[PDB]
Amino acid sequence: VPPKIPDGERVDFDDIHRKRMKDLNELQTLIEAHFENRKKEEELVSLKDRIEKRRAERAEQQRIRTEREKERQTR
Amino acid sequence: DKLKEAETRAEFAERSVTKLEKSIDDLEDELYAQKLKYKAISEELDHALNDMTSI
Amino acid sequence: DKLKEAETRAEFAERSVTKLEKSIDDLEDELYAQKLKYKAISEELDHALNDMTSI
Amino acid sequence: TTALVCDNGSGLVKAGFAGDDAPRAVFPSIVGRPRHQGVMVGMGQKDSYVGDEAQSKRGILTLKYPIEHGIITNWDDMEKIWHHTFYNELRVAPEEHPTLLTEAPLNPKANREKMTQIMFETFNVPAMYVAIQAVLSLYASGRTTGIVLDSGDGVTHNVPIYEGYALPHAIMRLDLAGRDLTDYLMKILTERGYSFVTTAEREIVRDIKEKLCYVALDFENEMATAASSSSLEKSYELPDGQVITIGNERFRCPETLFQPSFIGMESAGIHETTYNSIMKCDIDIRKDLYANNVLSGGTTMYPGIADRMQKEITALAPSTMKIKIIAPPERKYSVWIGGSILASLSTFQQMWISKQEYDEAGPSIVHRKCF
Amino acid sequence: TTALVCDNGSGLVKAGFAGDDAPRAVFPSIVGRPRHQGVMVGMGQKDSYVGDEAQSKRGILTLKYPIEHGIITNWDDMEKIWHHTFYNELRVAPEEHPTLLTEAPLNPKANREKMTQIMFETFNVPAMYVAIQAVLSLYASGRTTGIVLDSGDGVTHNVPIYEGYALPHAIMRLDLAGRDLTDYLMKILTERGYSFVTTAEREIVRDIKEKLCYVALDFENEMATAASSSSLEKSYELPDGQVITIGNERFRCPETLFQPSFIGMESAGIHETTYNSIMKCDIDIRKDLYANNVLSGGTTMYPGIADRMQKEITALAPSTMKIKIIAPPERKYSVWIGGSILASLSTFQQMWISKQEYDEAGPSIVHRKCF
Amino acid sequence: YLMKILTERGYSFVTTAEREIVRDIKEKLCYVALDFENEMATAASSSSLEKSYELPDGQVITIGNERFRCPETLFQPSFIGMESAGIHETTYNSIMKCDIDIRKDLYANNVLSGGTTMYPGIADRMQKEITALAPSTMKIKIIAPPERKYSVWIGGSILASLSTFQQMWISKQEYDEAGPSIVHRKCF
Numbered sequence A: 001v002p003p004k005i006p007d008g009e010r011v012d013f014d015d016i017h018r019k020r021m022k023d024l025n026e027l028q029t030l031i032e033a034h035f036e037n038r039k040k041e042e043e044l045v046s047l048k049d050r051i052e053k054r055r056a057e058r059a060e061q062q063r064i065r066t067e068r069e070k071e072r073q074t075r
Numbered sequence B, C: 001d002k003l004k005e006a007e008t009r010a011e012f013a014e015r016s017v018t019k020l021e022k023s024i025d026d027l028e029d030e031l032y033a034q035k036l037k038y039k040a041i042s043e044e045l046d047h048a049l050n051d052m053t054s055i
Numbered sequence D, E: 001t002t003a004l005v006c007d008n009g010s011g012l013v014k015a016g017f018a019g020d021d022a023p024r025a026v027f028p029s030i031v032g033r034p035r036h037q038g039v040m041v042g043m044g045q046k047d048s049y050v051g052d053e054a055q056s057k058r059g060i061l062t063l064k065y066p067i068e069h070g071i072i073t074n075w076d077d078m079e080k081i082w083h084h085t086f087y088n089e090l091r092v093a094p095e096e097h098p099t100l101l102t103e104a105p106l107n108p109k110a111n112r113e114k115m116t117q118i119m120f121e122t123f124n125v126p127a128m129y130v131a132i133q134a135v136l137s138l139y140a141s142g143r144t145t146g147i148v149l150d151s152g153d154g155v156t157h158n159v160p161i162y163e164g165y166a167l168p169h170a171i172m173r174l175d176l177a178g179r180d181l182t183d184y185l186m187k188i189l190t191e192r193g194y195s196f197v198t199t200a201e202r203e204i205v206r207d208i209k210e211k212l213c214y215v216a217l218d219f220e221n222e223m224a225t226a227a228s229s230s231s232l233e234k235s236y237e238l239p240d241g242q243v244i245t246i247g248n249e250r251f252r253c254p255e256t257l258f259q260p261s262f263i264g265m266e267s268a269g270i271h272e273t274t275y276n277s278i279m280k281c282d283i284d285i286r287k288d289l290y291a292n293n294v295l296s297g298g299t300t301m302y303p304g305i306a307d308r309m310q311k312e313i314t315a316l317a318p319s320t321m322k323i324k325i326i327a328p329p330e331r332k333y334s335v336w337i338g339g340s341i342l343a344s345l346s347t348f349q350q351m352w353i354s355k356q357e358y359d360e361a362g363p364s365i366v367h368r369k370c371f
Numbered sequence F: 001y002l003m004k005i006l007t008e009r010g011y012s013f014v015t016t017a018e019r020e021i022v023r024d025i026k027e028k029l030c031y032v033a034l035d036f037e038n039e040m041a042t043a044a045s046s047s048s049l050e051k052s053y054e055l056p057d058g059q060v061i062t063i064g065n066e067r068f069r070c071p072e073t074l075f076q077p078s079f080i081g082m083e084s085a086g087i088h089e090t091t092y093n094s095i096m097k098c099d100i101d102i103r104k105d106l107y108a109n110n111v112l113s114g115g116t117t118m119y120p121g122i123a124d125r126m127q128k129e130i131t132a133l134a135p136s137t138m139k140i141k142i143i144a145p146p147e148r149k150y151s152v153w154i155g156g157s158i159l160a161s162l163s164t165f166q167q168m169w170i171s172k173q174e175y176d177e178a179g180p181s182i183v184h185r186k187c188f
Ligand SMILES: Nc1ncnc2c1ncn2[C@@H]1O[C@H](COP(=O)(O)OP(=O)(O)O)[C@@H](O)[C@H]1O
Pocket: D008, D009, D010, D011, D012, D013, D151, D152, D153, D154, D178, D179, D182, D206, D209, D210, D211, D297, D298, D299, D301, D302, D332
């Protein structure tokens, strides 16, 4: 015996409408996430600029100290 | 005897740090160059979407 | 003795080696992560252009 | 309470609670036992990794799909997949949730009866209902007419529907689908030197197919162009390096859909079984079916298929009718979105197969009025 | 004039004029440069000994096969092998003789195109034709149907043919062959103490495999018998004395064919890829393929394989069909005998790729109508 | 091989007792060159490499370019007449025999152990060689713990200290029932 669908009333072509309506909401949330993400990630470039200044000063320090040790060792 | 062991150990010890220092600074420079590449790529289409924000 | 003035250095390079190895291991890992992210972004741009390829 | 809209599929199991927009957990349906010996003790090595866990340890497993062509060939593995889906990907005990499975048209009865028997005895759900995979895809489009071509990964079927009245004599089910395209791509890649044999490397070939292949608008012109210039050769990096370059294998793999003679199948392509399915319908609803042709399923995501199919049907169909091909961007999950919509309806709330009904008539209840 | 039926193979090059019963010159295809320094002056030491000459001076050479798995990996060495074959083993200049090479199924295109380009530019033959190695083995049996399992030394492929119409969608090519069996035997000999490492000692292990190994009718019973009695231990004298005794390594080396999990390969044995190749064929020609299963190639010469394979297929196949395995005594040269027969036909005389045709379309002519 | 190339300067060690002296020379002086040809060229012009060593009775000896030629045999086994490829290429071959999806992890977790891998400068030569062989994208990392020599024994101690392993021992009654061939059985 085939399944006889009972008596309903509606609906059509509306739930798809409301579901597709939130495309603007999705676009806004995605673009907001992208903007805030780039803004909160580019600061690592400045952090690595700090890393570069630290490596430059440590390299100068090590050059000076190794020259000092070469001076104080070769008797 | 053990004196010679100490001299050899200390002499070889200096070898590892100095060679690694140059590699460390090269790694830092390459990392920073790549990060700058990405940041330059980052802001362009970011502003393009800023213009494209709601058309 | 003459032992300690070098053994002081002998132990000294141990922490040097440890710092250098952990730092370089982190550097290469984060560099590879950045390279993968950049590759992902570039592929995203190109293949997003090509998935469009007019409609 | 809320209903569980599971969708077994063949290749990707998609599940989630009724009333949402997208499935909560989507993961390949593969169960892979380890094949090597294993020397580390106490590593906590399990005997079978299922779902998305076996797509990360696939280097030492032998993945095997439990669903071949719509039908289920290995019931123990399918039970394991369902148990994983309920308990670990959704974390909701099935004792308190109705379920809505999906099934391809024209499938063996025993498969459906065993499915309902498992759901009622092992997992002990309150009530389950089985629905045809094409009606849901028609729900999701918000239409009420139209002929839907649901080219999944296991089987491609083409169910025409008018005004809500399905036409059972016009269903054309063809067994060419994404898996055969993966095998054919893996077979034509050998013409350049790349040999993929292991069941784990089938996944790599599937990734190549997804990311690179596209359907050509005109086949002969593309074959001529790819044989002279080199503007098509796109490269791809394997999971270990050694990039590969795909030439005219790009549009030859998905061309099998429109010429099933490539893999030795006799039948006509998906461009001509739709026209045949239409022509079996009555003479007065052919215009509406022509205008509301719906695409669904994963395999219809190839870039450029909604134009090739329209060109082919326009060539076949009479010149006056308008041919329109609905290709929503959410094609892959169209069946599941439709399933969620159907499970969320109030009119549908009394069609479930309640457990007391199963206790009175046995598993053969599914073929009865509660379809 | 007469045609040259060359057959590159992988492990033994077999050549001879068309129309005879056996190849004129059969010699291993190895090119070995000397590796030590060399102190005698004027000894006339060459820079590369090829063919059967390098199987006598192998003590101070590093032999390396130029063909790995059907495909050719080192084109200069292959050119050297061909030059030797034409000029010293047959002593016929190629300027006055058509050639009929042979190629495994599903091989890379570039290999075939380079082969034809070499034959037309360097050796400058009048006309050459490339044929699939299984159709010839079917010629030699005098049949016109049947599914042929050509387990060579490089690659094992299984081409089903009916009424002269090959079924391109049912070719199952597997890369386990005699070379992998040699390596596995060399690897399991280490369990008794005998270590062979040098590329020259691979030849000794190959001789052991040829002279002693056999395929067991039932594997578990043989494993149990060899572990209790000592009626199987056969001894063999190395090229310098120190006889060795092979125990249950005798039937464990060629058992890898039916259980490729021994060498870590995933795929199924040669007993099950034949059944799978049959089942891909149409439902009405399966009886004929069952009744006309053909064996060929060197590696199918193990004593007792024509019974093990029949037992396995009879286990797999339906009980009503009759399973018959054709194993002619001239198995090794079956492909070349078939090649001679094909080259001697009058109907075939206009299928050669004439040189003017190559000059007009380039090396890509081989994929065209002249296959 | 070191005992055989020392004869090129005049020092002859023959007795099985003097093999121990040559072993001590190898341990204390030899090192693996980062690039072989450059070292061979440098040692043939300058004299900054010649390190001396005092035998158990005096008569110091001076080792020239024998220093990095002895352990170079590892990467070129043709020196001692062996056919096979060096330890830099058998690792890559061992990797390539593995499946295509676990090659990245094996590339990143290459482990060194055993005594002979204690030569000063081997963890860089091996990495350079494998990076030359391997695809350019994969990261090659060579784990060289300072406790290399006793690595096997430390691992053995850890394995014997595990609770999960406590039932894998070959108990004596089991040996009495199946004979010495029990080791090949389930208790591996
Ligand atoms: N973006 C894509 N491009 C091309 N093919 C795809 C894409 N996504 C999925 N596929 C193919 O579709 C299959 C998944 O189909 P799916 O709709 O999940 O099947 P099912 O009906 O069993 O759920 C995959 O095996 C893949 O081959």
